[PDB]
Design a protein around this ligand. Structure first.
Ligand SMILES: NC(=O)c1ccc[n+]([C@@H]2O[C@H](COP(=O)([O-])OP(=O)(O)OC[C@H]3O[C@@H](n4cnc5c(N)ncnc54)[C@H](O)[C@@H]3O)[C@@H](O)[C@H]2O)c1
Ligand SMILES: NC(=O)c1ccc[n+]([C@@H]2O[C@H](COP(=O)([O-])OP(=O)(O)OC[C@H]3O[C@@H](n4cnc5c(N)ncnc54)[C@H](O)[C@@H]3O)[C@@H](O)[C@H]2O)c1
Ligand SMILES: NC(=O)c1ccc[n+]([C@@H]2O[C@H](COP(=O)([O-])OP(=O)(O)OC[C@H]3O[C@@H](n4cnc5c(N)ncnc54)[C@H](O)[C@@H]3O)[C@@H](O)[C@H]2O)c1
Ligand SMILES: NC(=O)c1ccc[n+]([C@@H]2O[C@H](COP(=O)([O-])OP(=O)(O)OC[C@H]3O[C@@H](n4cnc5c(N)ncnc54)[C@H](O)[C@@H]3O)[C@@H](O)[C@H]2O)c1
Ligand SMILES: O=C(O)[C@H](O)[C@@H](O)[C@@H](O)[C@H](O)CO
Ligand SMILES: O=C(O)[C@H](O)[C@@H](O)[C@@H](O)[C@H](O)CO
Ligand SMILES: O=C(O)[C@H](O)[C@@H](O)[C@@H](O)[C@H](O)CO
Ligand SMILES: O=C(O)[C@H](O)[C@@H](O)[C@@H](O)[C@H](O)CO
Lengths: 338, 338, 338, 338
């Protein structure tokens, strides 16, 4: 029950994974690596958060490169190469790979040479198996050393798509995610040679963007392979995003049957993963929501019994970070006594 | 060729209609009414615009309630009741009804008692006939005294829907407009009892909202009646919006055939109404664009030869205001020698 | 110890006063009046807040115009005229006047005819006596029926000015408040004939504005009468503001002596009113801060031992609302057994 | 009269210098270097600007690394080391150093080894002489090879300070610049270990920041050495900033005398550098303004005849870029026949 975890990349996801982990007893963070964030600086970035407010616990700078958070010691490193991080020195079993620059199996596996046993990439991967809690975590096997928790958008769309497909079938679906800007964007028009639109002033523009999240649902849900795709629109909010899923079902279904199916799943097998609301929600109301997907019943609309537009919110930082921790706890039980 | 026009409601639409009218010779603005905007105040609101920059022409405060703009005199009024506006005193033939509070035929017809001959409501109407330039203006008849130019969103969606339906048929379509906030929204959480979400902080929220624009296309294009609906997402930008149209076609069509059809229309019968671009556009690039609908070829995506997502921009202020003036000029020729 | 309070104007201040009152046992809210907010709508505006997050307690719609919040019944009214509010029917002793349209003694006194005993205007007043907790509340006398809690800015500047003047003397001071936009501003360029700049797009502009807050300090601190003035700059944030006080002292003083004096007061007589920080704060870090004034030691700067620039934050909604409740509790003890 | 100019760093300043240079005949841009911006990408970043709108001229991609802008060929390079840029190959005499990473004389002088004769650093320098057009350009001597155009803020404050000091004397002054965010800031809370506050979410925060601009005025105006300092507040606007100068004069002066002195200079020796307005301006009204400093007469305020707060706007991108070109043209005439 003592799951020792390390974090590589103390950014938005790394710090919010950290914040949720230290406020609970299911997982212990023992080590953090980030070459661009010194230990005293890390304490400040943890204490003060523009999006999620001040850290509630207690923080102390104990030694040169240690922090004491809630009477627990955490060692910090500044290694640019993951192979140089001594995870095994402190008994790190599971590493959260949240840098954004080690998303392939060949790069992420460098944590294993440092003593780590499992690596969980906090992003989609070109070749590592992807998992979405509540959709396909039971397909995990203990022989898998490098895994992916997919993207925030996939974690929003896949639980919803599972409910719709299981109950009424998805013949075809097209998705738009209206998505808050992120750390990859620019404050003013700047270089983004791999994504020209993505370099434009983040808080002044609606910015079309590509995403693999809808195609990735066809990997976590194989029966939907080739039946979903979509795109993204980056808009001037700093956090919280929303999925807009236009799909044609296989069976006739009313919008009230869709609502009831989602509400049923939200209270049953997908409790804590898929939420259901009928309130007049706006994006700030979902800031800090721990679910992966919050279905907005009153925002969607149906054209007919076969063609519907479904709206589901997600805090792209908070919900996804909790899934990382949920995934770590799940595979920790499988690797031991399941 | 001397079309004398009056404007009721010197707001976003009223001032941008005014700005585009006085910078051309097709239409003469002679009178303006707004009880909440005095004449000296009107000069300042015309000169300085947070969205479209400074007025390029010359402005003078000639008398108590007159302005001289580009050597032309414009009289201003402060009447809360449209029937008390003496349009006929200065020969006003066509009135732009841009207050937002006289959108019914029974209310808008009050301008006729003041000497006006035709009223053009700058919004959808519950009962006045709606027109979209490039789609159904030829259905106008000179016996129509009160008419509507529909909404900005309908003026974006209808020209695009006409091209798609004429070439490949629209079996069904679902639309989302990612829309800049407007004057009906609130700076901070405030009362909006007719639209609870619409009262929430405008520049901090993604705000789902209802819209009749997609159903209204079925009125301007009768063959599409009942085949389109949708919703809106208000986001923290001050101007420029974008339509996201997910539709199933009647005939197999590739995305390249869709691009070519739109580009063809943009250079032919819909020139100046429907635009076509392949550039890496973001919303600020369309600020000041005179078209009603700018198709973004590289932002859309197709799932298959029958299911596509189409993206089209519109400056919800500038393009719509030019259509009002285009509509006035068109019906002025019909009412005289067509 | 049972202070029965009513609220007129269920807006930003009215709802945040309400939220802080019901979460404590010093004051009981029993009645609320707002003609533009129905009872079921009031529950939604209380539950969801774009700035301060979701309401933590429990909310129920008990009858036609009653809410049950934390097992306490609150009656709601929709009266445009304060004299028509039956405060005395439910034993309302103190009324929070937070509409913004009854700031004079002659208008605010209308609550007295409805059964209320004291009225506290949540804004500056042209003639009602103004009070700032920690500065001059001891000058209150039980014969005063209509009083003002001044403005948020005055509540930030006055406690700081008191410390500086008491320790080193203020010979002269000039203040700028960089202030979040508020409900009086517009989402896009709109009519504001009493303040032309104030009508311009709120979240796209730095907007100079007038303020009486610095002169008002000379009323709450009479020795500073005529020695302070200033102005405001409205900027695109939805909450939290900061005072920038440039002053010449009467005695030579180093910046470290200023820091120590403020820190001393923050731990002594001004505890809970004036805060002190040396951290690298930005505006969101002060969201929800209960103090009236949080001195930012590392942000200020001194030119010499007589000329200094002092920086102090304030949550213009949260801190001010707590002062209203603090003021009610103080005068309730004076009106009874002091 | 043929001044051949090169640009190092095709960013905000580099592109806006370029845009203003190619639209005039005083200066010819012949070469550009930026390793992170390819030639085809450079054309797109030039054509579309989120802040200053679309480029008005004509752009063509002529060869592999050439652009044709207004029938003029411009060669582009991708060299990380300035010494590897072959400026002399195309006759580049003057180089605009606008990368932000070569601000010292020892680093900026690397352009000289590539064939360049003069280097103009588009920022303050630790050791290169700084110049402000209209204040001290006549102190330039032809033996100076590496020079600085100071910062945008210094270019706003120095012309104003010169007028005040020349007419009434500045005994002491404290400055705050309310400044738009820039490319050095972050879209969301990110690493900024040299400036902790500067890493926080740019468009959601008021962010205190240090600046040397006020002390730098004491270098361009030696008589003011040690009499001015100040700080900055970064706020959520993408462009346009404003200086707030609180100063004590040496002689009694009314605010009307200050207005008249500034207006006089704006029409005389500082024409085109210092502007004067009495209109109800907000920040967007100054977007694209070519002046270095636009005095806002109605926004400032005086406490007494010796203590005043002065407000002056500046487009931190557009005005500063024009000064770079003005400085190049000035020293080009001095280096030849003055
Ligand atoms: N932000 C979101 O909403 C979100 C949601 C889901 C997944 N993700 C994914 O999580 C990853 C991180 O995203 P983010 O928003 O937290 O980014 P971020 O930029 O906020 O954080 C990345 C962190 O990595 C650190 N880092 C950089 N190079 C490093 C190295 N060589 N070794 C160690 N640390 C290094 C940086 O200093 C920074 O602290 C990306 O793959 C992203 O796509 C992001
Ligand atoms: N803003 C857009 O993007 C947009 C686009 C298309 C259509 N429209 C429609 O145009 C109308 C106006 O929209 P807007 O954004 O310009 O609104 P706005 O609030 O900016 O302007 C409305 C104007 O009407 C004036 N007014 C109010 N009552 C009046 C009265 N009794 N008599 C005369 N004038 C009066 C107001 O003072 C204000 O100047 C609405 O119907 C709106 O839906 C708006
Ligand atoms: N917002 C701030 O930061 C702040 C800080 C300190 C003081 N204040 C002062 O508090 C007052 C309210 O400010 P706010 O920001 O809460 O405004 P707001 O517009 O958010 O709220 C005002 C409320 O008054 C209600 N109201 C209007 N007319 C009414 C009437 N006749 N009877 C009853 N209720 C009525 C409105 O429906 C609304 O709910 C103003 O005087 C303001 O200057 C505001
Ligand atoms: N932005 C303003 O308002 C402003 C005003 C006045 C002065 N300045 C100064 O101008 C400089 C640039 O500021 P900016 O806002 O344009 O920054 P920016 O980040 O927008 O542009 C900097 C450019 O430099 C390029 N670059 C980086 N390394 C390079 C290298 N080794 N060789 C060549 N090019 C390289 C980058 O790719 C980028 O295009 C800074 O010194 C800044 O302080 C900025
Ligand atoms: O799946 C992915 O790649 C991401 O989650 C993606 O959907 C978002 O980060 C963004 O909106 C795409 O630009
Ligand atoms: O057609 C309409 O009603 C409007 O144009 C509408 O689409 C927009 O104004 C908004 O996005 C809907 O809330
Ligand atoms: O004292 C006052 O009048 C206000 O508090 C005032 O300072 C602010 O509301 C605003 O910044 C001024 O426009
Ligand atoms: O002079 C300087 O250093 C800069 O111009 C400076 O004033 C601004 O860039 C910013 O507001 C300071 O953080």
């Amino acid at each position: 029950m003592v799951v020792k975890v390390g974090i590589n990349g103390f950014g938005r996801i790394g710090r919010i994974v950290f914040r949720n982990a230290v406020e609970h007893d299911d997982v212990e963070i023992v080590a953090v690596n980030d070459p661009f964030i010194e230990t005293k600086y890390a304490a400040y970035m943890l204490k003060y958060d523009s999006t999620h407010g001040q850290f509630k616990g207690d923080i102390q700078h104990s030694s040169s490169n240690n922090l004491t958070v809630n009477n627990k010691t955490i060692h910090f490193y500044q290694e640019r190469d993951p192979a140089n991080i001594p995870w095994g020195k402190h008994g790190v079993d599971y590493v959260v790979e949240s840098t954004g620059v080690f998303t392939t199996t060949e790069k992420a596996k460098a944590h294993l040479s440092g003593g780590a046993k499992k690596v969980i990439i906090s992003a989609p991967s070109a070749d590592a198996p992807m998992f979405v809690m509540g959709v396909n975590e039971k397909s995990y096997r203990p022989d898998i050393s490098v895994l992916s928790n997919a993207s925030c958008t996939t974690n929003c769309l896949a639980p919803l798509a599972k409910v719709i497909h299981d109950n009424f079938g998805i013949a075809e679906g097209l998705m738009t995610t209206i998505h808050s800007y992120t750390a990859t964007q620019k404050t003013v028009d700047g270089p983004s040679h791999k994504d020209w639109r993505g370099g434009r002033t983040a808080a002044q523009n609606i910015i079309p963007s590509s995403t693999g999240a809808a195609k990735a649902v066809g990997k976590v849900i194989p029966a939907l392979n080739g039946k979903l795709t979509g795109m993204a629109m980056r808009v001037p909010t700093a956090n919280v995003s929303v999925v807009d899923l236009t799909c044609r079902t296989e069976k006739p279904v009313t919008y009230d049957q869709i609502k009831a199916a989602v509400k049923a799943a939200s209270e049953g097998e997908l409790k804590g993963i898929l939420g259901y609301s009928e309130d007049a929600l706006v994006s700030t109301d979902l800031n800090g929501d721990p679910r992966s997907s919050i279905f907005d019943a009153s925002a969607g609309i149906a054209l007919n019994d076969r063609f519907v537009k479904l709206i589901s919110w997600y805090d792209n930082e908070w919900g996804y970070s909790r899934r990382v921790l949920d995934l770590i706890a799940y595979i920790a039980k499988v690797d031991a006594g399941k």
